[PDB]
Design an enzyme around this catalytic site. Structure first.
Site, PDB file in Angstrom:
ATOM      1  N   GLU A  26      74.231 -25.264  36.229  1.00  0.00           N
ATOM      2  CA  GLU A  26      75.496 -25.832  36.667  1.00  0.00           C
ATOM      3  C   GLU A  26      76.616 -24.840  36.969  1.00  0.00           C
ATOM      4  OE1 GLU A  26      75.738 -28.344  33.115  1.00  0.00           O
ATOM      5  OE2 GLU A  26      74.892 -30.016  34.258  1.00  0.00           O
TER       6      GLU A  26
HETATM    7  C1  LIG Z   1      70.701 -27.146  31.725  1.00  0.00           C
HETATM    8  C2  LIG Z   1      71.910 -28.035  31.983  1.00  0.00           C
HETATM    9  O1  LIG Z   1      72.232 -28.322  33.137  1.00  0.00           O
HETATM   10  N1  LIG Z   1      72.580 -28.458  30.915  1.00  0.00           N
HETATM   11  C3  LIG Z   1      73.387 -29.662  30.978  1.00  0.00           C
HETATM   12  C4  LIG Z   1      74.443 -29.608  29.856  1.00  0.00           C
HETATM   13  O2  LIG Z   1      75.477 -28.699  30.213  1.00  0.00           O
HETATM   14  C5  LIG Z   1      75.049 -30.971  29.470  1.00  0.00           C
HETATM   15  O3  LIG Z   1      75.651 -30.868  28.187  1.00  0.00           O
HETATM   16  C6  LIG Z   1      73.969 -32.054  29.436  1.00  0.00           C
HETATM   17  C7  LIG Z   1      74.494 -33.450  29.191  1.00  0.00           C
HETATM   18  O4  LIG Z   1      73.420 -34.374  29.059  1.00  0.00           O
HETATM   19  O5  LIG Z   1      73.257 -32.071  30.687  1.00  0.00           O
HETATM   20  C8  LIG Z   1      72.474 -30.887  30.851  1.00  0.00           C
HETATM   21  O6  LIG Z   1      71.703 -31.028  31.993  1.00  0.00           O
END
Ligand SMILES: CC(=O)N[C@@H]1[C@@H](O)[C@H](O)[C@@H](CO)O[C@H]1O
Ligand SMILES: [Cl-]
Ligand SMILES: [Cl-]
Ligand SMILES: [Cl-]
Length: 499
Positions: free
Chosen positions: A307
């Site tokens: 992200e």
């Molecule tokens: C690897 C990644 O993208 N991490 C995100 C994270 O920042 C967030 O806290 C979470 C919420 O469900 O979603 C994930 O996908």
């Protein structure tokens, strides 16, 4: 008779499902005089003391651990076809014996044993028992070498004791790696001598505001030591170039506009970015990775890479091209989220795929191509193993952007043929991440971690041939009285016929 069964639990009724189970004969019964016999070595006694500590409270027995005599419970290291993590468990009136090539194997055998014993074993006061262990033989080895659980301590901070508690939760299911998300937008949780403010300022708060926290070098070392005693290799993550507000807010010089942003206490993502165009950015990264590597006896270092939406593609590629080599510079193997697959992963690197069923073909292809190029794959689909995702629209905690994830969905799949076009041999294993935007205390972690946590462990450990929802849910249902006795809150999914 849920708490104290009249008869012992089936030898095959354990999670992960063992590779081979052959029941037979009478069970073993632990009595007041049972001794735990181990080999005459430091590591052997270590596993012995661990087992003794798990049994003493509920049994009330002495359970001495010694390297002499023919103890009823024998843990022995010997040659065999069990690899670095497998073991053989034999049970009968003559006693219980756990054999393995290494301590990790004996440790895993113990995890199976505690499930063969009755729910009462979880209690803290002496219980009547009986302390029966089904008779027969179990020969067990893991399918995948990467079986991890991640705890996000950046969104909401969890201290050393709370992390040790989570470590004990995961150790029950033979996970062998603990991924710690040590930094994000809402906090920086590890002290860095070269850049003091990262922890003192960047770790001062968390989601929702108020007190935050961080691990001093000593506290981090203790977490690593404790994890190692539970045979968990710690994989630390310092997310970059995105999810860096805590660091950015701590040092204005790191920001593109030279202005330190305020500390962040919200729950959104994708707005922060290290300034790829400044040289100070790479001095910072080098110092942090160097210091983190020094505190990491493990083989891996996670640099994140997810992200980074405030980082133009070209800059992201340039950034990763420059920082990846830094990891190897300090003798570690780089790990990153699958966005790294679009930034030329270095040799030996592993990428963690968090995509979903609905993810576009182009994205999945880029990851599959990396696998073809030799990049190892760690599977942790957001719509499969993210423990922070709601079970249904009515779940009181967690998120729902990846849709809802009930127990069956989380379990019912095969890592080997999950990512279209990806070579099965490229799959190193799986991971169950627990993000904490909505979780602030240990009990909430448990409610979102259980009952899906055991399922992901099975996917990483059990043979594909043993995978089946209808029979698995029966084994999962059996965990109810154990968790109740242990005080582990869990979601009583209607898909599971709870015991
Ligand atoms: C690897 C990644 O993208 N991490 C995100 C994270 O920042 C967030 O806290 C979470 C919420 O469900 O979603 C994930 O996908
Ligand atoms: Cl526990
Ligand atoms: Cl916000
Ligand atoms: Cl968002």
């Amino acid at each position: 008779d849920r708490k104290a069964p009249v008869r012992p639990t089936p030898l095959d009724r354990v999670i992960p499902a063992p590779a081979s189970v052959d029941p037979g004969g009478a069970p073993y019964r632990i009595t007041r005089g049972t001794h735990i016999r181990v080999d005459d070595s430091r590591e052997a006694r270590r596993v012995g003391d661990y087992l003794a500590d798990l049994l003493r409270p509920a049994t009330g027995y002495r359970l001495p651990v010694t390297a002499h005599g023919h103890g009823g419970i024998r843990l022995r290291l010997a040659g065999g076809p069990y690899g670095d993590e497998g073991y053989r468990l034999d049970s009968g009136p003559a006693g219980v014996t756990i054999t393995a090539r290494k301590a990790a194997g004996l440790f895993h055998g113990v995890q199976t044993l505690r499930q063969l014993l009755p729910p009462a074993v979880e209690k803290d006061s002496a219980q009547p028992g009986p302390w029966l262990v089904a008779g027969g033989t179990i020969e067990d080895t893991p399918r995948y070498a990467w079986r991890s659980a991640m705890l996000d301590v950046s969104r909401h901070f969890f201290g050393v004791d709370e992390v040790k508690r989570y470590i004990d939760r995961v150790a029950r299911y033979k996970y062998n790696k603990l991924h710690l998300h040590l930094s994000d937008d809402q906090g920086w949780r590890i002290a860095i001598d070269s850049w003091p403010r990262l922890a003192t300022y960047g770790g001062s708060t968390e989601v929702g505001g108020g007190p935050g926290g961080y691990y001093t070098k000593a506290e981090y070392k203790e977490i690593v030591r404790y994890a190692a005693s539970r045979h968990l290799e710690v994989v630390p993550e310092i997310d970059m170039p995105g999810h860096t507000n805590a660091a950015l807010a701590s040092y204005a010089e790191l920001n593109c506009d030279g202005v330190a942003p305020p500390l962040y206490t919200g729950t959104k993502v994708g707005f922060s970015s290290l300034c790829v165009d400044k040289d100070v950015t790479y001095d910072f990264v080098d110092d942090v990775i160097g210091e983190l590597a020094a505190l990491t006896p493990g083989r891996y270092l996670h640099i994140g890479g997810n992200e980074a939406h405030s980082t133009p593609k070209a800059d992201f590629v340039a950034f990763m091209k420059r920082v990846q080599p830094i990891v190897a510079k300090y003798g570690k193997t780089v790990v990153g989220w699958h966005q790294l697959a679009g930034a030329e992963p270095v040799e030996g690197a592993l990428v963690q795929y968090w995509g979903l069923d609905r993810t576009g073909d182009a994205e999945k292809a880029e990851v599959a191509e990396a696998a073809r190029n030799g990049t190892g794959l760690i599977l942790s689909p957001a719509d499969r193993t993210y423990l922070d995702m709601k079970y249904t629209k009515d779940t009181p905690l967690g998120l729902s952007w990846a849709g809802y994830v009930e127990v069956q969905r989380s379990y019912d799949w095969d890592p080997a043929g999950y990512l279209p076009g990806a070579p099965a041999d490229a799959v190193r294993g799986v991971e169950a991440p627990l993000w904490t935007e909505t979780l602030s205390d240990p009990d909430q972690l448990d409610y979102m971690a259980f009952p899906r946590l055991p399922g992901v462990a099975e996917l990483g450990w059990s043979p594909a041939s043993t995978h089946d929802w209808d029979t698995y849910k029966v084994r999962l249902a059996a965990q109810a009285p154990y968790w109740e006795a242990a005080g582990i809150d869990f979601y009583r999914s209607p898909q599971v016929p709870w015991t």
